[PDB]
TrEMBL record, chain A:
<keyword id="KW-0602">Photosynthesis</keyword>
<keyword id="KW-0793">Thylakoid</keyword>
<protein>
    <recommendedName>
        <fullName>Photosystem I reaction center subunit II, chloroplastic</fullName>
    </recommendedName>
</protein>
<keyword id="KW-0603">Photosystem I</keyword>
<dbReference type="GO" id="GO:0009538">
    <property type="term" value="C:photosystem I reaction center"/>
</dbReference>
From TrEMBL, chain B:
<comment type="similarity">
    <text>Belongs to the psaH family.</text>
</comment>
<keyword id="KW-0934">Plastid</keyword>
<keyword id="KW-0603">Photosystem I</keyword>
<keyword id="KW-0793">Thylakoid</keyword>
<keyword id="KW-0812">Transmembrane</keyword>
TrEMBL record, chain D:
<dbReference type="GO" id="GO:0015979">
    <property type="term" value="P:photosynthesis"/>
</dbReference>
<protein>
    <recommendedName>
        <fullName>Photosystem I reaction center subunit VIII</fullName>
    </recommendedName>
</protein>
<keyword id="KW-0603">Photosystem I</keyword>
<dbReference type="Pfam" id="PF00796">
    <property type="entry name" value="PSI_8"/>
</dbReference>
<keyword id="KW-0934">Plastid</keyword>
From TrEMBL, chain E:
<keyword id="KW-0812">Transmembrane</keyword>
<feature type="binding site">
    <location>
        <position position="37"/>
    </location>
    <ligand>
        <name>chlorophyll a 1</name>
    </ligand>
</feature>
<comment type="similarity">
    <text>Belongs to the PsaL family.</text>
</comment>
<keyword id="KW-1133">Transmembrane helix</keyword>
<feature type="transmembrane region" description="Helical">
    <location>
        <begin position="138"/>
        <end position="160"/>
    </location>
</feature>
Amino acid sequence: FTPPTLNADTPAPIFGGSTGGLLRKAQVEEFYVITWESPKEQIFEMPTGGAAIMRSGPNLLKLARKEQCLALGARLRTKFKIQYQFYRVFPNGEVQYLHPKDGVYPEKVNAGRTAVGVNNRSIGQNANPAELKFAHKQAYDL
Amino acid sequence: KYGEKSVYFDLGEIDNTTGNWDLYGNDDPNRYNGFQNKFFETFAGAFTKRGLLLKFLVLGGATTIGYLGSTSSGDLLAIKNGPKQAPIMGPRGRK
Amino acid sequence: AHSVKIYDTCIGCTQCVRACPTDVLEMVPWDGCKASQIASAPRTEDCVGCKRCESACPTDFLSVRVYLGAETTRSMGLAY
Amino acid sequence: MTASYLPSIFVPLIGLVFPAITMASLFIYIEQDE
Amino acid sequence: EKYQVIEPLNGDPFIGGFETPVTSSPLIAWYLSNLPAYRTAVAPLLRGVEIGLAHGYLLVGPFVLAGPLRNSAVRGEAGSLAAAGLVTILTMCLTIYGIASFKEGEASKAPSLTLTGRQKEADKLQTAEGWASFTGGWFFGGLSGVAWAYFLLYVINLPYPVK
Amino acid sequence: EAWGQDPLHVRPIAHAIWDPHFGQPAVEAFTRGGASGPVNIAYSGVYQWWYTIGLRTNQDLYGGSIFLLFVSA
Amino acid sequence: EVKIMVEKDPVKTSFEKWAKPGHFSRTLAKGPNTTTWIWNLHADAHDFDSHTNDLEEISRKVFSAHFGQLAVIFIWLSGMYFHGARFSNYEAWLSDPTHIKPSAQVVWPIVGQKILNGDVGGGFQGIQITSGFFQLWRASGITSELQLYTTAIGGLIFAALMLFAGWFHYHKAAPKLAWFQNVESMLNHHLAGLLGLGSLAWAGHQVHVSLPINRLLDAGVDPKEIPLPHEFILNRDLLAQLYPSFSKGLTPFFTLNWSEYSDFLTFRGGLNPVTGGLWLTDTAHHHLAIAVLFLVAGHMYRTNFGIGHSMKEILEAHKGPFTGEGHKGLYEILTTSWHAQLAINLAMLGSLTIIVAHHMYAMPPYPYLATDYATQLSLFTHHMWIGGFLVVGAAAHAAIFMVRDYDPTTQYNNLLDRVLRHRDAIISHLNWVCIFLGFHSFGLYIHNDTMSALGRPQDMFSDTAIQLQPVFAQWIQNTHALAPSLTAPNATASTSLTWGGGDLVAVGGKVALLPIPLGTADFLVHHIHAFTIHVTVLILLKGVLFARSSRLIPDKANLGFRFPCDGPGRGGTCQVSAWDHVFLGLFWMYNAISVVIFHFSWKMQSDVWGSISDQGVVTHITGGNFAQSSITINGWLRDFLWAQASQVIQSYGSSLSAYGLLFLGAHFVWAFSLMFLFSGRGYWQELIESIVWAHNKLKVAPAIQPRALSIVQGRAVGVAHYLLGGIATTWAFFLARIISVG
Amino acid sequence: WVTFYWHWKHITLWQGNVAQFNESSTYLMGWLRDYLWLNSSQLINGYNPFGMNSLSVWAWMFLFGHLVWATGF
Ligand code: CLA
Ligand code: CLA
Ligand code: CLA
Ligand code: CLA
Ligand code: CLA
Ligand code: CLA
Ligand code: CLA
């Protein structure tokens, strides 16, 4: 799966402005950009507070947090049945593809995915903190 | 382009994209005419930061307040005026 | 950020992945349950610590465990 | 009191100057990036 | 399809702000653009001098008419010294703020883009030496303004309604 | 010393007060224990304790304070 | 088209669902796995929106529940009238109202509680009542207990009638949704037919019953030989000798020679010197005028005869450049959401109750009401608390609407959307004004405390120090005192004795009302009131505006309205739900109303209430120390809380001992609330686990598993007990103090 | 509770009227009135509109502690 590139010619939804939007964090640290395809002009609710009309086609919306991107994407998926994907954008122009890392949503199991953080024992079989005294590691890290 | 269409995201213009604008930052350089005196008289503060200005401020606040508290007269400051009436004396005859 | 761990008691119901608001968990192939899948947390650096994944796990005690810590920028959920 | 001026000296220092220096130094220290 | 006075910040609906008459009226915007804090091309020292002059001059009054010695014959001197002490404390505040915020040798991070998009030069006030010069000018101007207010009020004794 | 000469009718003094915020009524209200200015009346029992263990004069207490400074050093 | 629409027999009248507790909801209808179920059964019983999504069924439930509430209120009123008929000294109080304490409750002699039957006067022993019912019945022209009995029987009949009406309109003929959505017809009927006709009817009563009986009472006639109201209606010559204009007999009304009715339709103002209440001629003219006004106003909206206003078209036509579509889409909001209507009506009812509290003491509408200081204080405090609770409830239901009933699709660029879109600016500025008010009021109090403690009384904020005179309120009082001279020339007296003029009404040997002076203390206390109100508004408005989403949790609408938190992430999301904002706004409303009632009590006991002697010397209950003691927090602690609480704590062994008992018990309940407020839930769950082990060791563990209260339930219990304890402490304290000193 | 008991017992012992404690300590209204309300009269009069005395500092600290308690709330 080849990640898509972030096009800079994608029109944004019709929005009248809000006090909940990009702030100094967006210009010093990072922000996010969500893109989705819509079949018709319909009203959705902005995750930052308000309402907007999505374009009849490609859309491009700037967010300040990843959680807002997931909220808008979940509403789009379960309400408008719209596929979406977002990116993390840095002040230096670096764009990172985020949500469908392999093109398939995380709810569906996909081959080629590595098991990270999986422990091969029961949760109650953890080592006691006393045995790991003065060792710079945690019981769950074993 | 940022303003060519309804697009508001552009990697070539990240300051416009992120809203890093200066709303009232006028850059007109002609404000004052006679300012040689102000440059001349201000050498202890400018381009000193932690070395000269801070030490001078600490010394001139400590010495200033010490002098004021040590040389204040009775009328201006009541704590240094001292008691004037007789002791009120406490209960059970304890003094 | 926070530390998220998955245990072999997982049954591959995917309910922890759907409850995650920052897309930290994902389902990977596995052979220890009927569902032939197990949860995993490859991108915990985005975890905020809500433990909504913990509330959605149906096992007696949780197959997914969030331990908190660090409290970085993404962890604190700050937009400024 | 042997030295009545000595309270009038010390109380202002430990009351205003010592806190000023202490808080300035601690603010400079806790805002270092290193 | 009406007039719709209110507009988003620079036309961007996804920036956290608005265009209101309070924000960007021609008169309000002209007033704010010519304040010494927003004259980026002018040296920080002179802007600091102006700011300190104004602030000490306005600060002298409250201390004089509300201080503990406002009923005494040293009311003016006490108020002026209180204003000068507040100016000195704020000078220490500015110095420590500059020490913590700015590091020597770094470029200014102030916004260098106008609303139109002229891409002017960055303001030098947001630099270590710029802030040091600003603090020195503010100290000098604050002391000067306190002295001027004391002279006008008491040494010269101009007729004023309340004092 | 005054307390020791007459314990049942002398109030112990903790330390002097130098509050620039006091008014004259506050200056004269807190002048107790035969002091020349505002003082605090001790309620820690140090006067009784030091009188019991043999300390009698202010020089004894000063010597004890210097000795304890040396001990802390 | 406005028409009557009902459904026949929608719900069968059966006890089958009575045996099933949680029938109304799918979750609770299964059964009690845990003890939480029981609490949930009582927390979702009246949440009709949660039972089903059908708006018709919700509307029917709401209508029938309103009928049930009306029946309950009728039972309560019938009980009050019954207790006035039998267990009261109402007639003795009629004979001598200035020296007999009203009483309508008599205790049984069981455990020594018979001491509570105090000597109220008139050969009667009982609890001294402070509800003002005696004065209300005196105003209504009631002279015998037989009339109270017949009123109580009618009240029972009306309660049964309302109960039957609720049953009929739920189970037999239930209106359809179109019937409920006829808001124009409802407004026309409730303005012309409910308020206008009710005011007209009460004006008729006053003209024909209250005025003659009350003027005979003011003349000193013994109530026994005062002719009955029907003798005034029938023998109109008997009514005309009191007011000659009745001899004209409706001719002036129809010839438009209305000035001939000036005998009993006056615009005097002020107070009746004999009774200390408002003139009932002024009240009759008032009620007639407002009846005419409401009957005119109720002909404004178009139902089905043309001629009128469509509220939808009125709203859609009001928009401007600073707003978007303006009032577009609000008609659907207010005709399809019950919670929005409840929020508006609760806010208006609370503000209206506060207006009532402020206006009933400045113009006592009932005879011998002002001189009954206990009744005045009780009425003010009661209605203040009712109003505050209603306002907080309005905030709660606005939040509920925003969470559940809000539809973004039909609300675009209108007023609600735009308010949602600059909530950050609103809350920022409201926070700033709250901080500024808190500083420049309470810091002024702290400044006064410090300068008083430092021996610098000249540096304080008082009348003998730096003065903060309320010049605007003083100017308003001056303007209102001179209103009859130039601005309302057809007025005899000003609106109230509180404005000014040097007039003092003194029924018996007490003081009814006098010009209330405003100084630095009043400036300070009003700014304290403003601070508290703005902080309460901040909490509630921040809860409402951020109910759907915020920068912390962008999907707070999915979480719901009543949820504990979202987790310990993002630094901790404790109390992010709008329910928690209401939970804190309850505390802040408590503080606001408490300070308001304390200010009222101290100001009245200090500057208004008192006794006047034969010479003309007026002494006050406290002694006019509000101007110099209310400026200091120590003054509040000592001259008000410590000095005026001497009677509640010394009430033991007397008829007021119940007030001391409840004073201490309310203290207890408040302290008890503190642990539900301070503690968590895991601790109690683990303690319950240990107790369950103890029970299991003896095979006595229940199958319904004991669980600790939920987090939201813990907060609800804490706030409920907190408010109950505080309000009951004040209730006991005021009642004991004002019964002792009056 | 411990210090309240100690203090009231010793106030009524030192004043010589122990009957007040013996009669009033059996019910909580006695604790509120004869100990808390009764013994706070001189405390709250430390400073008043008519002047101030040496107990003004303790009145100010009393109110200060009340304020810090509420901020903890
Ligand atoms: C911990 C012990 C202690 C404490 C609480 C105080 C408290 C006080 N002193 Mg005293 N003092 C002390 C020891 C102490 N003193 C000793 C050992 C000396 C001998 C040098 C003095 C000599 C002294 C003078 C000459 C005067 C005071 C005065 C005062 C008052 C104003 C504060 C001030 O100016 O300090 C000044 C204090 C010093 C110069 C002594 C140095 C500081 C000592 C050694 C303690 C420092 C360490 C201590 C553990 C604190 C740790 C900080 C924190 C972690 C708690 C205040 C009541 C003034 C007064 O009477 O006003 C009415 C005044 O004029 N002090
Ligand atoms: C415990 C330490 C302490 C001490 C020693 C003082 C001392 C003083 N305070 Mg108080 N104050 C304190 C803590 C303290 N304050 C705290 C914590 C607060 C906050 C609650 C206040 C709030 C407060 C107020 C609100 C006021 C005072 C005022 C005063 C002054 C009394 C009036 C006077 O001197 O005549 C009149 C004053 C003068 C003749 C000279 C004052 C100006 C001199 C020059 C100040 C020294 C400035 C110097 C350059 C910098 C030194 C400090 C720096 C190193 C940080 C006096 C200097 C009064 C005053 O006059 O304020 C200025 C006043 O109105 N104080
Ligand atoms: C005897 C006549 C009768 C009978 C058999 C029924 C039977 C039924 N009704 Mg109907 N109903 C009646 C009279 C009757 N109702 C009347 C008179 C009214 C008008 C108020 C209603 C209004 C009504 C509504 C609005 C609804 C029902 C519903 C129901 C069903 C379930 C009710 C249930 O189990 O809750 C039993 C509940 C109770 C016994 C609680 C009684 C609470 C009373 C009303 C208030 C008492 C307040 C009290 C004085 C103060 C308490 C505090 C104090 C102790 C300090 C069932 C078919 C519900 C339904 O169909 O479900 C979908 C429904 O929504 N009824
Ligand atoms: C828990 C609810 C509650 C309770 C227990 C009480 C209890 C009491 N109220 Mg209060 N009150 C409340 C809520 C409550 N009130 C609210 C919400 C309002 C605002 C509408 C009022 C307004 C109010 C007034 C104005 C008066 C009382 C009075 C009384 C006393 C009853 C005497 C009586 O029967 O006269 C019943 C009341 C009257 C005969 C006069 C009422 C006149 C009003 C204007 C008519 C109501 C119009 C309309 C139906 C209300 C909705 C208006 C809205 C659509 C705009 C008693 C102390 C009376 C009092 O203190 O007597 C000493 C009194 O004069 N109350
Ligand atoms: C002149 C006509 C009229 C009058 C007087 C009223 C009066 C009232 N309505 Mg309204 N209503 C009307 C027309 C009218 N309505 C129309 C046309 C509609 C349909 C659009 C509605 C729809 C409506 C709803 C949806 C609700 C009300 C409610 C109420 C009551 C509110 C409680 C209150 O403050 O009452 C103070 C006065 C009293 C308590 C006096 C007792 C009631 C007497 C008997 C008057 C009843 C008038 C009645 C409408 C006549 C028809 C009944 C008849 C067949 C026997 C009040 C009794 C609310 C309520 O509480 O429901 C019970 C409520 O929820 N009404
Ligand atoms: C016209 C008035 C009115 C009406 C019709 C409603 C109607 C409703 N409210 Mg609203 N509300 C009101 C006023 C009103 N409220 C006011 C004044 C407040 C401020 C306190 C609130 C605050 C509020 C909140 C915060 C919530 C509601 C909820 C609800 C729903 C009830 C569900 C429930 O659990 O109730 C069942 C009934 C109870 C839980 C009451 C139990 C008894 C209470 C808690 C204590 C009684 C105190 C008592 C006087 C103490 C002394 C006696 C004692 C010694 C025995 C329903 C839509 C809930 C809702 O819709 O959730 C989605 C909800 O969360 N309301
Ligand atoms: C006495 C107890 C107390 C005090 C003082 C406060 C103080 C405050 N609360 Mg809190 N609160 C309390 C109890 C208290 N609360 C309790 C019990 C609850 C539970 C219901 C709450 C719930 C609560 C909420 C939910 C909210 C507040 C808010 C506020 C603020 C009001 C506005 C403001 O900041 O300016 C006024 C500030 C004060 C009056 C604090 C005292 C300042 C004095 C006057 C000056 C002292 C300074 C002096 C110079 C000394 C300097 C010290 C220096 C030497 C170190 C303020 C921080 C609101 C807020 O955020 O602000 C808008 C808010 O939303 N509080």
